[PDB]
Design a protein around this ligand. Structure first.
Ligand SMILES: CCCCCCCCCCCCCCCCCC
Ligand SMILES: CCCCCCCCCCCCCCCCCC
Ligand SMILES: CCCCCCCCCCCC
Ligand SMILES: CCCCCCCCCCCC
Ligand SMILES: CCCCCCCCCCCC
Ligand SMILES: CCCCCCCCCCCC
Ligand SMILES: CCCCCCCCCCCC
Ligand SMILES: CCCCCCCCCCCC
Ligand SMILES: CCCCCCCCCCCC
Ligand SMILES: CCCCCCCCCCCC
Ligand SMILES: CCCCCCCCCC
Ligand SMILES: CCCCCCCCCC
Ligand SMILES: CCCCCC
Ligand SMILES: CCCCCC
Ligand SMILES: [Ca+2]
Ligand SMILES: [Ca+2]
Ligand SMILES: [Ca+2]
Ligand SMILES: [Ca+2]
Lengths: 591, 591
C-alpha cells in the first residue's frame, strides 16, 4: 500500500562522517530528478512518483525512445492521455528513472547501497494464488496478468511452462500406451519422441514471434541498459574484434570443467560399484553418496567464481549480454553434472563390466540388470519430489521459524520483513526446466513413462513457482525480453544429442544387454549416422513449413508499420500521329 | 540509339481479322498509359517515354511504393529533382509501367505477343569489354557499372564470381604446395580445404548484407510482381496450408529422378568397365560414351516437363517464388548427373571390383589404378575447355554463319538482328558455378591441383560471360534481387557433403586402394562421424563470430532508419519537507 514504488536501503558499513555526506548525494540526486523521497527508515529510503504531470512526461519520454529505436512501431500518444495502463509499465519507468546514467545509485557496486525493490500487491496475489489453482490451464488473459505485474521476463517463463505443459499431454498418453502394451525400448516410441521434440521447438520459436510482438516488445536488443562496469578507450566504442581473441579462452575453460567435474563423478561412480564386489554392508552404501553430494556442490561453486572472474574480462557493454554470456558458461557445468551420472551407467556397464570388474584397488560378477532403470527413476520421479520440498517448502519454513525467534505504522515491519527475503532469478528457474527436457529427449526409451512424471510435475511446478515469487522472495523489478534467451538455442542442442543417444540405446538393448557381444561395425555406428541424419532432414522440413505460415499478431506488425509510413507520406525522326494513325500502319500489313 | 526503351514484337499466327482488333488493344492500352508508341515495324512496336514530366511522376510513384514497403528507407525526393540517375533504373520503371496489372500485354501467355526487350548500348559495352580485359580484378566502381545497366540480378552474379575468384587464390597456392611437396591424399590439405569452404560461405552471407543494402535493395521479397497464372478463390488469398499438402508431392519426384537417372548412369558406367574385360578394341570404346551423352540430355529434358507440369500445380502468387521452386527441383537432377559418375568410381571400384568382375552378362582383373585420377582431370580441366567453346565460341559461330546465308534506316536491320538472338538467364549461369564448387569440396583430395584449374577458369569465365551478354544474347531487362537466391542455401549443403566425402576418401586411400581390405568398424564410420561433427562446431564458431561485426553499409542502414523516425517525431501520511529536511532525519541516526 501507501503508493510506494521502490525502496532504497543502506548498509552502515564504515565511519559515519563521510556517510553523512553520501546520504545527501543519494538524496539530492533523487529530489533533483524524482519526487517525494521519504524515509521513516529503520535504513531504507522510500520513493514515490513526483507528480501527476512530471510522471506523465517520463512515460512519454520512454514511449518515444523505444519507438524511434524501432520497437513500439505505432505512434506515441502525447502527454494528454498518456496513462501508463499497466502496473509493471509504471514501475519500469521509475527504475529507469533511477538506475540509468546522465541519476545512478548504481545499486550493486561502486557506491554503498544494497538493493532497490518494489513492494508486493498482496491482495491481487491472494486472489490469483487461489484462483487458477483450480483450472487445468490458465488463459491468455491470465498470462497478461503475470505480464502487467512482474514485467515480461517473468512473463515468458510462465508462458513457456504453460506451453510446455500443454504439449506434454501427447507423450504422456502415447508413452502410457507403450508402457502398458509394449515393453521398454520399443522402436516405435523412440521415433515418435524425437518427432515430438522437433515440433515443440519449432512451435515455440514461432510462438515467441507472436508473444514478443503482442506485448509490443520485439526488438528490445536495440534498447539495453548499459553496464557501469565497462572500460572503453575511445569516444563517438570498445572494438568487438578484441572480444574474439579473448572469447576464444572460453574453450579451455570448458575443457577444464569437463576434466575436473569429470573426475569426481567418475570416482564416485567407481566406488559405488565397488560395494557390489567386496563390502559391513549397510554402513558403506552412503559413502559414495556423501562424497558426490558434497564435492560437486563445492566444485561447481568454485567454477562460478572462475567463470565470473573470466566473464568480467570481456567488457559486454549491455546488461543482457553479460547475463547471457555467463549462462552459456554454466550450461557446460549443468550438462556435465546432471547427465554424466546416467550416461556413465548406460554406456559403460551394459557395454562392459567384465573389463572393469578385475580392477580392485579402491579398498565373479553378473550385472545387476536394473541399475539403469532404477537410476532413471531417481531423477525423473524421486528427485522431482525431494527437489520440490527443497525449493518451496524448506525455505518457507526457514523464513517462518526465523521470525518467531525474533518475537499507526505496522507495515514498517512488513516492509522490513519483505526486505529480508531472497531475490528471484528466472535464469535459475529456467535451468530446472531446460534440464528436465533433456531426460525426456536423451533417456526416455528407458522406462517410457517419464512424460507422465513431468506432466504431473509441471502442473504443480507452475503453481509452486508462482507461490515462491509472491510469498518466499521479493518482487522482481519489471524487466523486458523478446525471447527466453540462451536456453532456446540450448534446448535445440539438447534434442540433437537426444537423437544420437536414444537410437544408440535402442539398438544395444535389442532384447539383450550383456556387458563385446553386440556388433558395432555395420550396426552401432551405422544406426547413429543414419538416425541422426534423418533427424536433420525432418527438422529442416518442419522449420521450412512453419516459416510459411505467419501468425496473426506478427502479421498485424508488418501491416501496421506500412500504415505508419503511409501517414508520414501524407504530411528525332518520330512522326506517326499518336496511336489512331499508328494503328493504321499495322492494318495495311496483311502479307 | 534513337531513345528507344523497349520493343514489343508480334507473332502473326492466326487469321488477321481479329488480329486487326487485337493490334488496337495492345496499342490503345499503351497510349492511354505511356507515350510515343511507334512502329516502323517489319512486326515489332517501339515504345519511348511519354514526356519529361509524365515519366518523372512514374519514377516518383515507384520510389514512393518501395519506400513504404520498407526498402528505400530514406525519404523519397519529390518530382522537382527526381532524375532517375541510372540507366537500369529508368528502364525498370517502364517495364513495370507495361507488365503490371490494373496495362498488361502479359508477354508470355494469354495474349499473342512474343517478347519485350530493351536495346544494347553498344558504345559502352565496347569500352568495357576491352577495358577490364587487362586488369586482374575489377573494382567496386566497375561492378556498379554492371549494376547501373543490366539491373541487379545480373549484378549479383558478377560480384559473386569476383568474390569467388578472389578467394580462390588461397587454395590455388596451398594446393600447389601440397602437390609439389606432398603427394595426394594428404591429411593436412583436406583439413584446410574444409576450413576454407566454411569461411567463403560465411563471408558471402555477410557480403550480401552489404551489397544488397548499398544498392538500396534489402527487403525486395516484400515487393514482387505477381504472376498472371494464378487461380485464387477468395478476396480481401490462396491458403498457404494447402501448399504443404501439395509440396509434399515434391519428394516422390526426387525419388523418381534418382531412380531414373540413377539407372542410366549406372548402366553406362557398367558397360565401359566391360570393355576392360572382354572387348575389336578401338571401335567399342565410344559405345558407352554415345549412350551417356544422348540419354541423360534427353532424360533430364523429360524431367523438366515433369517438373514444370508439377510446379504449375502450386500457385506461387509471386514471380520470384515460381523461379526459386523450379530451381530447387532441378538441383536434384544436377546433383545426380554431375557427381554420380565420380562417386560411382571412387566408392565402388577401389572398395570392390572383385565382386563385380565375375558378372559377364552385358556382351583375372587388377584395377587400373588411375581410373579415378584421370576422371577427375576430365571435368575440372578438360570439360572446362570443351564447355568454354560450347557456350561462347560455337553459338557465336552459329549466329554469324546464319546471317551470311541471308546475304536512312539501317538500324531496323540491327534491331532485327538483335531480335533474333537468345535471352539470358542468370540461373543458367549460376549452376555452372555452384556445381564446380562441388568438385572443389567433394573431390579435391584426388589430384590437389584442382583450385588452380578453377582459378584460371574463373578469370576467363568472368570475361566470356560478360562477352555473351553483350554480343551473343539480347539485353536482360533490369531485375532486382537481395541475394543470389536458392544457390546460397545449396552452396552450404554442397560443402556439408564435402566434409563427409573427403574425410572418407582420405581413410581408404591411406597408401592403398585394393578393391574387404580396409577396416570399417572402428575406422571408416568413426572418421565420418568425428570429421563431420567437427565440421559443424567450426561453422558454428565462424558464423557466430561474423555475426558480431556488422559491416559499415548495413550499419548506415540502422542509423538511417533511426533518423527517419527522428524527423517524423519533429512534425497520505507524507510530511517530511522535501529533501533538505528529509536528510536531517538520517543525520540523527548514528547508532
Ligand atoms: C540387438 C543386437 C543385434 C545387432 C545386430 C543387428 C544389426 C544388423 C542390422 C542393422 C540394423 C540397423 C540398420 C541401419 C539403421 C537403419 C535405421 C535408419
Ligand atoms: C589405411 C587403412 C588403415 C585403416 C586402419 C586405421 C584405423 C585405426 C585408426 C583410426 C584412425 C581414425 C581415428 C578416428 C578419426 C579421428 C579424426 C577426428
Ligand atoms: C495450439 C496447440 C496445438 C496443440 C497441438 C498438440 C498436439 C501435440 C502433438 C504434437 C504433434 C506430435
Ligand atoms: C573405459 C573405456 C576403456 C575400456 C576399454 C575396454 C577394452 C576391453 C576390451 C574390448 C576391446 C575393444
Ligand atoms: C528419428 C531418429 C530416431 C530413429 C531411431 C531409429 C533407430 C533404429 C534402430 C534399429 C535397430 C534395430
Ligand atoms: C542449417 C540448416 C541445416 C539443415 C539443412 C541442411 C540439411 C543437412 C542434411 C545433410 C544430410 C547429408
Ligand atoms: C576482403 C577479402 C579478404 C581476403 C581474405 C583472403 C584470405 C583467403 C584465405 C581465407 C582464410 C582461409
Ligand atoms: C554393389 C553393392 C553391393 C555389393 C555387395 C558386395 C558384397 C561383396 C562381399 C562383401 C561382404 C560385405
Ligand atoms: C574438418 C573435417 C575434415 C577432417 C578430415 C580428418 C580425416 C581424418 C582421417 C584420418 C585417417 C587416418
Ligand atoms: C543450426 C545450428 C547448428 C549448429 C549448432 C549446433 C551444433 C551441433 C553440434 C552437435 C554436436 C553433437
Ligand atoms: C559437453 C557439452 C559442452 C557443450 C554444451 C552446449 C554448448 C553449446 C550450446 C549450443
Ligand atoms: C540427392 C540429393 C537430393 C538433395 C539435393 C539438395 C536439396 C537440399 C538443398 C538444401
Ligand atoms: C539424401 C539427402 C537429402 C537432403 C535433403 C536436405
Ligand atoms: C562436445 C560438444 C560440443 C558442442 C559445441 C556446440
Ligand atoms: Ca522443481
Ligand atoms: Ca523453482
Ligand atoms: Ca563455363
Ligand atoms: Ca556461361
Amino acid at each position: 500500500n501507501h503508493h510506494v514504488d521502490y525502496v532504497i536501503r543502506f548498509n552502515y558499513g564504515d565511519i559515519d562522517t563521510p556517510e553523512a555526506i553520501k546520504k545527501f548525494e543519494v538524496l539530492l540526486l533523487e529530489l533533483s530528478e524524482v519526487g517525494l523521497q521519504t524515509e521513516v527508515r529503520q535504513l531504507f529510503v522510500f520513493v514515490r512518483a513526483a507528480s501527476k504531470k512530471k510522471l506523465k512526461r517520463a512515460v512519454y519520454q520512454s514511449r518515444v525512445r523505444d519507438w524511434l529505436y524501432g520497437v513500439r512501431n505505432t505512434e506515441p500518444e502525447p502527454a494528454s492521455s498518456a496513462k501508463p495502463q499497466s502496473e509493471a509499465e509504471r514501475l519500469l519507468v521509475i527504475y529507469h528513472l533511477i538506475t540509468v546514467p546522465k541519476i545512478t545509485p548504481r545499486h550493486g557496486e561502486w557506491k554503498n547501497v544494497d538493493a532497490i525493490f518494489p513492494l508486493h500487491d498482496e491482495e491481487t496475489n491472494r486472489q490469483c494464488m487461489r484462483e487458477w489453482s483450480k483450472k487445468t490451464f490458465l488463459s491468455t488473459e491470465d498470462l497478461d496478468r503475470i505480464r502487467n505485474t512482474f514485467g515480461e521476463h517473468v512473463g515468458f517463463y510462465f508462458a513457456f511452462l504453460q506451453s510446455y505443459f500443454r504439449f506434454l499431454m501427447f507423450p504422456a498418453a502415447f508413452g502410457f500406451s507403450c508402457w502398458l502394451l509394449l515393453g521398454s525400448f520399443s522402436i516405435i516410441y523412440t521415433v515418435v519422441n524425437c518427432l515430438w521434440c522437433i515440433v515443440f521447438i519449432e512451435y515455440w520459436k514461432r510462438q515467441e514471434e507472436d508473444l514478443s510482438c503482442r506485448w509490443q516488445t520485439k526488438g528490445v536488443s536495440a534498447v539495453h541498459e548499459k553496464r557501469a562496469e565497462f572500460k572503453p578507450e575511445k569516444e563517438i566504442v570498445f572494438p568487438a574484434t578484441k572480444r574474439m581473441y579473448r572469447q576464444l579462452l572460453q574453450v579451455p575453460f570448458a575443457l577444464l570443467a569437463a576434466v575436473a567435474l569429470g573426475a569426481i563423478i567418475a570416482t564416485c561412480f567407481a566406488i559405488e560399484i565397488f560395494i557390489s564386489e567386496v563390502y559391513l554392508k549397510g554402513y558403506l552404501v552412503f559413502i559414495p553418496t556423501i562424497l558426490v553430494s558434497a564435492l560437486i556442490p563445492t566444485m561447481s561453486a568454485v567454477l562460478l567464481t572462475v567463470a565470473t572472474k573470466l566473464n568480467d574480462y570481456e567488457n559486454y557493454e549491455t546488461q543482457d549480454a553479460y547475463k547471457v554470456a555467463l549462462t552459456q558458461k554454466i550450461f557446460v557445468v549443468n550438462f556435465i553434472t546432471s547427465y554424466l551420472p546416467i550416461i556413465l551407467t548406460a554406456f559403460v556397464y551394459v557395454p562392459f563390466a567384465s573389463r572393469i570388474v578385475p580392477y580392485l584397488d579402491v579398498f565373479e560378477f553378473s550385472i545387476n540388470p536394473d541399475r539403469l532403470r532404477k537410476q532413471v527413476i531417481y531423477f525423473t520421479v524421486t528427485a522431482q519430489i525431494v527437489g520440490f520440498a527443497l525449493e518451496t517448502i524448506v525455505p518457507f519454513v526457514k523464513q517462518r521459524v526465523f521470525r518467531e525467534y525474533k518475537e499507526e505504522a505496522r507495515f514498517l515491519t512488513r516492509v522490513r520483513n519483505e526486505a529480508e527475503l531472497e531475490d528471484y532469478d528466472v535464469t535459475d528457474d529456467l535451468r530446472e526446466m531446460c534440464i528436465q527436457f533433456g531426460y525426456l529427449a536423451l533417456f526416455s526409451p528407458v522406462w517410457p513413462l517419464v512424460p507422465v512424471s513431468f506432466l504431473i510435475n509441471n502442473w504443480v511446478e507452475l503453481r509452486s513457482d508462482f507461490f515462491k515469487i509472491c510469498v518466499e522472495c521479493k518482487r522482481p523489478w519489471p524487466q523486458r525480453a523478446d525471447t527466453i534467451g540462451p536456453w532456446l538455442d540450448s534446448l535445440g542442442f539438447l534434442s540433437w544429442v537426444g537423437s544420437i543417444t536414444s537410437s544408440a540405446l535402442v539398438y544395444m538393448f535389442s532384447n539383450g544387454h550383456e556387458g563385446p557381444t553386440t556388433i558395432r561395425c555395420w550396426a552401432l555406428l551405422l544406426t547413429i549416422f543414419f538416425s541422426e541424419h534423418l533427424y536433420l532432414i525432418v527438422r529442416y522440413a518442419v522449420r521450412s513449413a512453419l516459416a510459411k505460415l505467419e501468425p496473426p499478431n506478427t502479421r498485424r506488425e508488418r501491416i501496421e508499420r506500412f500504415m505508419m509510413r503511409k501517414r508520414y507520406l501524407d504530411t528525332f525522326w518520330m512522326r506517326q500521329r499518336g496511336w489512331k494513325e499508328s494503328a493504321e500502319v499495322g492494318l495495311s500489313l496483311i502479307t
